[PDB]
Ligand binder design. Structure first.
Ligand SMILES: CCCCCCCCCCCCCCCCCC(=O)OC[C@H](CO[C@@H]1O[C@H](CO[C@H]2O[C@H](CO)[C@H](O)[C@H](O)[C@H]2O)[C@H](O)[C@H](O)[C@H]1O)OC(=O)CCCCCCCCCCCCCCCCC
Ligand code: CLA
Ligand code: CLA
Ligand code: CLA
Ligand code: CLA
Ligand code: CLA
Ligand SMILES: C=Cc1c(C)c2cc3nc(c4c5[nH]c(cc6nc(cc1[nH]2)C(C)=C6CC)c(C)c5C(=O)[C@@H]4C(=O)OC)[C@@H](CCC(=O)OC/C=C(\C)CCC[C@H](C)CCC[C@@H](C)CCCC(C)C)[C@@H]3C
Ligand SMILES: CCCCCCCCCCCCCCCC(=O)O[C@H](COC(=O)CCCCCCCCCCCC)CO[C@@H]1O[C@@H](CO)[C@H](O)[C@H](O)[C@@H]1O
Ligand SMILES: CC1=C(/C=C/C(C)=C/C=C\C(C)=C\C=C/C=C(C)/C=C/C=C(C)/C=C/C2=C(C)CCCC2(C)C)C(C)(C)CCC1
Ligand SMILES: CC1=C(/C=C/C(C)=C/C=C\C(C)=C\C=C/C=C(C)/C=C/C=C(C)/C=C/C2=C(C)CCCC2(C)C)C(C)(C)CCC1
Ligand SMILES: CC1=C(\C=C/C(C)=C/C=C\C(C)=C\C=C\C=C(C)\C=C\C=C(C)\C=C\C2=C(C)CCCC2(C)C)C(C)(C)CCC1
Ligand code: OEC
Ligand SMILES: [Br-]
Ligand SMILES: [Br-]
Ligand SMILES: [Fe+2]
Lengths: 35, 340, 447, 62, 82, 335, 28, 36, 34
């Protein structure tokens, strides 16, 4: 069982990072135009 | 043309339009809304349900109502000059008289009012889709206030005009009828929910689509009333859902006629099922189940669980709920879990 | 001169672009209002608390707080003198003056702009540091209070400890816990049933010895935001609108109301059951505890008493293999408190201590928490949903849990509100889209 | 001095019910903002005091 | 579009209104309050005085037994309590 | 040139893709799928689950409770209450099965993911210039479901009492509620009905009137729902032609004049109360239940004169007693 | 017996601080 | 239970807290006097 | 000519005050719990 744990955590992690690191660079600009 | 003289006055665009409908709609729609309030605050049902109705008795807004008549009555329309009260407001008041009353006047008020749509939309000149949409409601009321009672025992068992009064009606159904398990009612639900979902999906789907066709930071001054064309671009909003929830609209013409269906529709559904409860002809059991349950102390489904509730919400109820059928319930006899 | 130039009415409020001393004296307005309730209702409780009758059977929540620090305490928790309560109550109503008085000043006769007149007390939302500055400042003002307790538990009258050696009795915390891990640990783990983020605080030192760790953190924070302009990444993200700032610091609170409502609902320590009510779980355990006792006395053997479900009538094993009351109370096995702990052992309940060490007092305390449970009725009617009209108490812990939630909830939808629109200012969608250049009209429509 | 007390705060009672009504108008009404603005420091002197009067006075209760 | 609208949007501010109505409101308020303070209400709808629910003794409930002679029952069921 | 990540970050935020994979989506999708497929299967073959503590598994399902109204996904078991039961705990997947393990995994997912939909429901509100408060009307939704999956549980002991996912489990979950919290006697639950029983009432209108006012584009040759080719900036339906009616139904001033103050009101009614309800349940998860009038109304000597809501009490006491029979050995249900 | 007087006074206080402010005219 | 010498005052303080509701409730009195 | 505003405040007390009697009569009325 325990072996699965980590696999699962990793995945979870791999993503959040994708969520956080991702939402960071090139965002407040992510739209059509800024007026 | 005296006929046109009366007509003439009637349908004359007053402040709050009167109309031919006005001669039916308005009176009944009065003593009803009225009668409710009248008994709500002055009359007791103590001689039919030995319970307090009016605010005078001490009752609370929630705990007040014009309780249906004693089942001893039947479906007799308790006329004031009805052999029941023999003609006597005070008694006729005590024998529940107001019920058949409130119900029937409201009956004709609901009639008079649906006709209140057909009149206007025909003068003003528009599709009869409003009045048509009133079918949903005439059904609901008709199903749960006349047919139900009529096909059952007394006028008694019919809903009673109040809050806690109908709240009862609810549990009642969950109990000996197990309404919650009916295909129909499970659709009424479908309507009354989605219809609301729509009412809002579209509601705020609008407030957040429209354009800057006004100046300030508030949308109230924004164009209208009917001038410039359309506030929300049904295209810019479209691609919003077609990419979020997968599928969106096109053609506000239908989105405005599917908004009608949804509720007026589902609401009619239940109304049918409800007629089914008249003849107790309801959806209570799942044969395939009771039989597989009978011979196996190890098979339990929510269904059975729910099913046990009923007995509970019935054994304890009925007696003090159905006074006229002198229920005598020993302490033992009464079902109930262990320790509670 | 507004409403025509100002946007809307209901939303009429909110005028403020670079600066405004009106909204200044408006936060210094309302924020006075708050001080008023503090003292207003306080004086409304002391004006009630019967000589001696459960601090919770009376609608008291402000008092119950002032108590936990140790003002009017009493070996057991029984108020000793209805005076400390009064001191704050008025020191507030009076306090409502200063914080109130000048509130109405900056609001009508106060100088609008904060640039034309003063220049240090004048901001501008786009001003990155002015903003980043004031921050650490109020941060510093928190690091201060963050130390009163330190000095309230260590010097001016320790807190009321319901985990004292002989019974509840305001002792003075002398050994605050300064072990960076245990204190930095709490937050660092425990999310669910096993334990709570921070809702799980065994002793009153892990708190004092910890509030110390925070009174510094936010303090050494002023010396940082005050002393510093944004770093290099956060420039991006974190849109710097005035409105947005409202959300930024808003949805925080929403998170706090939640992490709040929980503390009162569960916590036994910072929320002594003696001043407030008996934590829900504590109630459920009171039940079994009682009937376990009522029964053992009748001559029964809880140790071997076989349940009706076949599980354990009074006791059973836990997924950890420990002993815990039975029936349904298993739902609350994680719960802990002073009246049971001694009647506890090395593997969970101890069949020995549970047979004779069952000291007399516990049976009753264990009783009170049974009768008085975190359940009631809107119109205050204590007892299960369907109890006759007689007792009418409704637990404070029940009241603080509910209340806050409704608030902390809405707030979360309140943060959405602004943090989502304010994303449209620095974008200009806020007011809709432009009738001529709608950004979707220039996109390769997927189909 | 049990007696004279009751009036010491029953003084800061009618003072502020009045301060509540005054102060406002003084920043809103054109009826000379300066004469009212000065009478303003009137009760704000009794205020500071009148409470402080109930101040050390409060200790002499029963 | 077209509107045969009468005054309204102001008639509350009407100087004569809050006058010939500073007499009609309270004259209506107490009018009813008496319909109550008298006890008339009861005698009107038959509603029981909080003392006239169960007779001083017996614990039954005057449930209307039949349907055609209902009133009669109520009759004797009323005199009952005494 | 931009490196490969700067691309990823455009693909995920591209306003082009068939269905937007917003950042939130990066946690929404992976989550949502986990749940669904899990549920979707254990809804088929769901080994006998034992919700309430007592070891007496009640497994409605298909490959057992061969039915659609019956079966559902059964909750966690008191035993491991409010405790996190991570599939990887059960010393045997068979163990993770007995103890409702499948439930959680799914719930936490559909919960958090819905939160993700909540968010990624605004990612376009921004990624595409337009007012952001669409996602806000989705608050009333989410929150609720949260109230019936997370709040009530945290509130009481363990998830054991958390809206079992399945038609009939709903009802059970509900009936229990009504019997432990006079939730039908709530001025909150009122507000769910209040609005829900409104949106239904109103969806019928705007849908009514609108359709009730359409120009003239085909003459029953085909249908009338063609009086609008998509994209046109005109408004197939006539506004004032419309109001002229409702203003004429209930006196004017009562029918809506401005169209934008209309459509808003449609999120106004639903969301406003659907929230309340969401709060109501979430409120009682702490035991501040509906009104208590049991006996309330009294007599002179003291006889108890019955309040309608007294009846409501029996139909409650009834369910009260029978629910979770043989699962508690004492007289007071404090959960 | 009844401070129902106090509450109404405190009440009428601020809703009539506006009256005087509107009858004296004063940029409200 | 208000310290003796102040008993004469519980009569008022008893209505003290219920002020705060009045304050948002007040910001409305004004706004109508200004027709919004 | 009475200030349209005061027409709304004097009345908004009528309900605000009557419902207050109402809410009291529920703590001592005939519909009390005593
Ligand atoms: C691991 C992966 C899971 C991911 C989850 C995905 C779903 C996310 C959706 C929303 C975010 C949820 C995040 C976690 C929610 C935690 C809920 C919970 O039950 O948390 C569990 C803890 C446990 O607290 C209790 O803590 C107790 C500790 O006190 C006990 O023990 C103490 C120490 O001995 C004392 O003795 C005390 O007297 C005694 O009572 C016990 O351990 C109990 O077993 C324990 O339940 O509670 C608390 O953390 C409350 C305070 C912090 C948690 C959050 C607060 C409220 C959050 C609600 C937000 C959702 C609302 C819906 C949103 C609406 C629209 C968006
Ligand atoms: C760098 C200078 C500076 C400092 C030291 C402060 C300090 C403070 N500001 Mg502030 N402010 C500043 C600049 C500053 N401000 C600027 C430039 C602006 C915009 C122009 C503002 C706008 C602003 C608003 C809108 C508000 C504040 C408030 C506050 C107070 C926060 C209340 C609190 O922390 O809980 C109190 C808890 C504590 C533990 C405080 C510890 C005791 C300390 C403060 C000792 C102070 C001694 C003295 C003041 C007596 C007590 C003060 C009183 C506040 C109790 C705090 C006193 C809030 C407030 O309270 O005002 C009504 C508030 O609403 N400020
Ligand atoms: C949130 C914190 C905060 C901040 C950043 C400010 C900032 C400001 N206030 Mg201010 N104010 C506040 C809270 C705050 N106030 C509160 C809570 C009240 C009501 C209790 C007031 C009442 C008020 C008035 C009536 C006036 C201001 C003025 C000002 C501006 C210049 C005066 C000044 O600030 O002196 C800086 C503060 C000090 C240097 C501290 C000195 C403290 C000494 C020891 C005592 C101060 C006098 C005190 C003994 C007598 C008080 C009476 C006073 C009203 C004259 C400046 C922008 C205006 C001003 O005076 O501008 C020239 C002005 O007329 N305020
Ligand atoms: C909690 C902190 C907080 C703060 C500081 C603000 C601040 C602000 N909000 Mg706001 N808001 C919040 C939480 C907050 N909000 C929450 C939790 C929600 C719901 C999730 C909202 C929803 C919201 C909306 C829809 C709007 C604002 C707006 C505003 C701005 C206008 C100020 C305003 O209109 O008040 C001054 C007075 C009022 C707003 C009236 C309040 C009293 C109401 C009308 C009750 C009326 C009584 C009557 C019985 C109501 C019947 C019930 C019925 C209304 C449902 C202001 C910046 C407006 C804006 O966009 O500008 C910023 C705006 O349109 N907010
Ligand atoms: C309690 C919270 C609160 C606070 C602090 C404010 C503060 C403010 N609002 Mg406001 N507002 C609120 C709630 C609040 N509002 C609500 C709920 C609504 C919805 C109706 C509004 C609707 C609104 C609008 C439309 C406007 C404001 C405006 C303002 C600003 C100017 C105030 C003014 O011109 O009044 C003038 C003051 C008077 C006419 C007399 C009021 C009497 C005083 C202020 C009360 C005295 C308090 C107490 C009884 C006396 C204390 C005694 C003491 C001296 C000892 C100011 C920042 C204006 C602005 O420009 O901002 C957007 C504006 O146009 N508000
Ligand atoms: C006429 C009588 C009546 C009416 C009108 C209602 C109405 C309501 N009751 Mg209710 N009730 C009644 C009688 C009634 N009740 C009685 C007699 C009882 C006794 C048991 C109850 C007990 C009861 C309980 C315990 C609860 C209710 C709740 C509700 C509300 C649920 C709807 C809602 O709020 O949405 C909010 C919910 C959502 C918006 C769902 C969230 C959205 C998720 C994500 C949907 C997921 C979609 C799915 C994943 C699809 C995936 C893809 C798909 C598209 C293919 C609603 C207002 C619920 C409530 O009010 O809390 C909110 C509730 O918990 N009732
Ligand atoms: C939630 C319950 C519910 C109520 C409160 C309700 C109320 C109303 N619906 C109306 C309309 C509609 N409802 C419609 C579809 C629906 N309406 C629904 C559900 C309701 N509709 C359901 C959800 C469908 C949608 C799926 C259509 C579209 C219309 C109309 O267009 C119409 C409208 O335009 O409204 C603005 C209004 C017509 C007024 C009228 O007929 O007066 C005449 C009748 C009178 C005055 C006498 C009352 C008649 C009744 C039988 C007497 C009962 C009196 C007592 C029972 C009072 C009850 C109070 C106690 C029981 C507590 C009225 C405000
Ligand atoms: C801010 C507004 C926003 C909109 C939402 C507001 C929703 C508020 C809902 C409140 C409704 C009930 C209030 C309870 C107060 C109370 O309890 O009054 C009761 C009667 O109530 C009532 O009479 C309710 C009045 C509703 C009747 C209106 C029906 C249509 C007629 C209108 C035509 C006008 C031309 C009587 O009280 C009783 O008082 C005694 C009996 O005399 C008893 O001893 C008890 O105390 C009992 O409570
Ligand atoms: C501006 C504004 C406003 C407001 C504001 C504020 C800020 C508020 C408030 C308020 C406040 C902030 C206030 C205050 C205060 C109060 C005071 C200042 C008072 C007093 C009182 C007293 C002092 C008392 C009491 C007492 C004593 C003394 C002791 C004991 C006894 C007794 C209880 C009697 C309004 C609403 C108009 C709206 C608009 C804006
Ligand atoms: C424990 C304890 C204590 C203390 C503690 C503390 C003091 C702590 C802490 C802390 C903490 C616990 C903190 C916190 C927090 C933080 C946070 C909360 C954060 C965050 C943020 C975020 C999350 C964000 C944002 C964002 C995102 C989200 C992503 C991207 C974008 C951005 C960046 C914007 C004491 C002893 C005293 C008491 C008891 C115990
Ligand atoms: C009976 C009868 C009749 C008629 C009738 C009537 C005429 C009725 C009525 C009536 C009425 C006409 C009643 C009434 C009423 C009302 C009331 C008693 C009310 C009220 C209330 C309320 C409701 C208030 C208030 C409120 C508010 C402000 C808050 C929330 C909402 C509400 C609305 C609740 C005749 C002789 C033909 C025949 C015999 C029988
Ligand atoms: Mn299923 Ca909330 Mn009824 Mn004890 Mn368990
Ligand atoms: Br059950
Ligand atoms: Br139990
Ligand atoms: Fe529309």
């Amino acid at each position: 069982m325990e072996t699965l744990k980590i696999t699962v955590y990793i995945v979870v992690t791999f993503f959040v990072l994708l969520f956080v690191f991702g939402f960071l660079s090139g965002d407040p600009a992510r739209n059509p135009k800024r007026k | 043309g005296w006929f046109d003289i009366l007509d003439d006055w009637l349908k004359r665009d007053r402040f709050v339009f009167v109309g031919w409908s006005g001669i039916l709609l308005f009176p009944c729609a009065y003593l009803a809304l009225g009668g409710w309030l009248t008994g709500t605050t002055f009359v007791t049902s103590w001689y039919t349900h030995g319970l307090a109705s009016s605010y005078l008795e001490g009752c609370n807004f929630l705990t007040v109502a014009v309780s249906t008549p004693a089942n001893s009555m039947g479906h007799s329309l308790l006329l004031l000059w009805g052999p029941e009260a023999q003609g006597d407001f005070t008694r006729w008041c005590q024998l529940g008289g107001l019920w058949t009353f409130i119900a029937l006047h409201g009956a004709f008020g609901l009639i008079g009012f649906m006709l209140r749509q057909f009149e206007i939309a025909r003068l003003v000149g528009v599709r009869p889709y409003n009045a048509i949409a009133f079918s949903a409601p005439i059904a609901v009321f008709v199903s749960v206030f006349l047919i139900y009672p009529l096909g059952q025992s007394s006028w008694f068992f019919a809903p009673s005009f109040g809050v806690a009064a109908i709240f009862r009606f609810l549990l009642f159904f969950q109990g000996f009828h197990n309404w919650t398990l009916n295909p129909f009612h499970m659709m009424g639900v479908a309507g009354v929910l989605g219809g609301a979902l729509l009412c809002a999906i579209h509601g705020a789907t609008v407030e957040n689509t429209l354009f800057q066709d006004g100046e300030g930071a508030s949308t109230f001054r924004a164009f209208n009333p009917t001038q410039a064309e359309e506030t929300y671009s049904m295209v810019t909003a479209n691609r919003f859902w077609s990419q979020i929830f997968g599928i969106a609209f096109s053609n506000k013409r239908w989105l405005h006629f599917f908004m009608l269906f949804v509720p007026v529709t589902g609401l009619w559904m239940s109304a049918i099922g409800v007629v089914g409860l008249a003849l107790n002809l309801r959806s209570y059991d799942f044969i395939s189940q009771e039989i597989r349950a009978a011979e196996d102390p190890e098979f339990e489904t929510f269904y059975t669980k729910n099913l046990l509730l009923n007995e509970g919400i019935r054994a304890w109820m009925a007696p003090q709920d159905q006074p006229h059928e002198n229920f005598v319930f020993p302490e033992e006899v009464l079902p109930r879990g262990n320790a509670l | 001169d507004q409403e025509s130039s100002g946007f809307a009415w209901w939303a009429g409020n909110a005028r403020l672009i670079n600066l405004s001393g009106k909204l200044l004296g408006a936060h210094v307005a309302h924020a006075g209002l708050i001080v008023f309730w503090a003292g207003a209702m306080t004086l409304f409780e002391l004006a009630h608390f019967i000589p001696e009758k459960p601090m919770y059977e009376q609608g008291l929540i402000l008092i119950p707080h002032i108590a936990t620090l140790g003002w009017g305490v009493g070996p057991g928790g029984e108020v000793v003198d209805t005076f400390p309560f009064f001191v704050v109550g008025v020191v507030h109503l009076i306090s409502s003056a200063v914080l109130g008085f000048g509130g109405v000043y900056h609001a009508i006769r106060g100088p609008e702009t904060l640039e034309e007149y003063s220049s240090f007390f004048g901001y501008d939302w786009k001003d990155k540091n002015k903003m980043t500055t004031i921050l650490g400042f109020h941060l510093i003002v928190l690091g201060i209070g963050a130390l009163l307790l330190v000095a309230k538990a260590m010097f001016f009258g320790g807190l009321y400890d319901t985990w004292a050696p002989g019974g509840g009795d305001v002792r003075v915390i002398t050994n605050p816990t300064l072990d960076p891990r245990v204190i930095f640990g709490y937050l660092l783990k425990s999310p669910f049933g096993g334990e709570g983020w921070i809702v799980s605080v065994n002793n009153l030192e892990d708190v004092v010895g910890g509030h110390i760790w925070i009174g510094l953190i936010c303090i050494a924070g002023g010396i940082w935001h005050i002393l510093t302009t944004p770093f290099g990444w956060a420039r991006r993200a974190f849109i710097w609108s005035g409105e947005a700032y409202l959300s930024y610091s808003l949805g925080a609170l929403s998170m706090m109301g939640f992490i709040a409502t929980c503390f009162v609902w569960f916590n036994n320590t910072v929320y002594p059951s003696e001043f407030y009510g008996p934590t829900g779980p504590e109630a459920s355990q009171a039940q079994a505890m009682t009937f376990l006792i009522r029964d053992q006395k009748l001559g029964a053997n809880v140790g071997s008493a076989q349940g009706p479900t076949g599980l354990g009538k009074y006791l059973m094993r836990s997924p950890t293999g420990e002993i815990i009351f039975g029936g349904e109370t298993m739902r609350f096995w994680d719960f802990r408190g002073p009246w049971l702990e001694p009647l506890r052992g090395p593997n969970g309940l101890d069949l020995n201590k549970i047979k004779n060490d069952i000291q007399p007092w516990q049976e009753r305390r264990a009783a009170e928490y049974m009768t008085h449970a975190p359940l009631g009725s809107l119109n205050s009617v204590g007892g299960v949903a369907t109890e006759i009209n007689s007792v009418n108490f409704v637990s404070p812990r029940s009241w603080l849990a509910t209340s806050h939630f409704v608030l902390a909830f809405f707030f979360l939808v309140g943060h959405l509100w602004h943090a989502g629109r304010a994303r449209a200012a620095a974008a200009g969608f806020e007011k809709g889209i432009d009738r001529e250049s709608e950004p979707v009209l220039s996109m390769p429509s997927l189909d | 001095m049990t007696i004279l007390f009751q009036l010491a705060l029953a003084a800061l009672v009618i003072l502020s019910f009045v301060m509540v009504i005054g102060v406002p108008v003084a920043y809103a009404s054109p009826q000379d903002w300066d004469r009212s603005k000065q009478l303003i420091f009137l009760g704000s002197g009794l205020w500071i005091a009148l409470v402080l009067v109930v101040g050390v006075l409060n200790f002499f209760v029963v | 579009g077209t509107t045969g609208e009468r005054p309204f949007s102001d008639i509350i501010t009407s100087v004569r209104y809050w006058v010939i109505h500073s007499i009609t409101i309270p004259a209506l308020f107490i009018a009813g309050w008496l319909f109550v303070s008298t006890g008339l209400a009861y005698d009107v709808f038959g509603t029981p005085r909080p003392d006239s629910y169960y007779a001083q003794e017996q614990r039954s409930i005057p449930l209307v037994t039949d349907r055609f002679e209902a009133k009669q029952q109520v009759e004797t069921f009323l005199e009952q309590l005494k | 040139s931009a490196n490969l990540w700067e691309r990823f970050c455009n693909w995920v935020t591209s306003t082009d893709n068939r269905l937007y994979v917003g950042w939130f989506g990066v946690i929404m999708i992976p989550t949502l799928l986990a749940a669904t497929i899990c549920f979707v299967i254990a809804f088929i073959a769901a080994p006998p689950v034992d919700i309430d503590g007592i070891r007496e598994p009640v497994s409605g399902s298909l490959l057992y409770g061969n039915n659609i109204i019956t079966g559902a996904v059964v909750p966690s078991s008191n035993a491991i209450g409010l405790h996190f039961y991570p599939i990887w705990e059960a010393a045997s997947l068979d163990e993770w099965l007995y103890n409702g393990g499948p439930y959680q995994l799914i719930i936490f997912h559909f919960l958090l993911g819905a939160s993700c939909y909540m968010g990624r429901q605004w990612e376009l509100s921004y990624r595409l210039g337009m007012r952001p408060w669409i996602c806000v009307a989705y608050s009333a939704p989410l929150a609720s479901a949260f109230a019936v999956f997370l709040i009530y549980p945290i509130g009481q002991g363990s998830f054991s009492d958390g809206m079992p996912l399945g038609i009939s489990g709903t009802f059970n979950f509900m009936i229990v509620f009504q019997a432990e919290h006079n939730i039908l006697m709530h001025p909150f639950h009122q507000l769910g009905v209040a609005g829900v029983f409104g949106g239904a009432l109103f969806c019928a209108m705007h849908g009514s009137l609108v359709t009730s006012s359409l120009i003239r584009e085909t003459t029953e040759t085909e249908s009338a729902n063609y009086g609008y080719k998509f994209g046109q900036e005109e408004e197939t339906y006539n506004i004032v032609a419309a109001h002229g009616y409702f203003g004429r139904l209930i006196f004017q001033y009562a029918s809506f004049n401005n169209s934008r103050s209309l459509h808003f009101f449609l999120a106004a009614w639903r969301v406003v109360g659907v929230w309340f309800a969401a709060l109501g349940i979430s409120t009682m998860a702490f035991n501040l239940n509906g009104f208590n009038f049991n006996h309330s109304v009294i007599d002179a000597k003291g006889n108890v004169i019955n309040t309608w809501a007294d009846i409501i009490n029996r139909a409650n006491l009834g369910m009260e007693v029978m629910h979770e029979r043989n699962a508690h050995n004492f007289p007071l249900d404090l959960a | 017996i009844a401070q129902l007087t106090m509450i109404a006074m405190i009440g009428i206080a601020g809703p009539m601080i506006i009256f005087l402010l509107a009858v004296r005219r004063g940029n409200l | 239970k208000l310290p003796e010498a102040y008993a004469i005052f519980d009569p008022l303080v008893d209505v003290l807290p219920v002020i705060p509701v009045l304050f948002f409730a007040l910001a409305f009195v004004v706004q109508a006097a200004v027709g919004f | 000519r009475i200030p349209l505003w005061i027409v709304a405040t004097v009345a908004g007390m009528g309900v605000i005050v009557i419902v207050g009697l109402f809410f009291y009569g529920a703590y001592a009325g005939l519909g009390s719990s005593l």
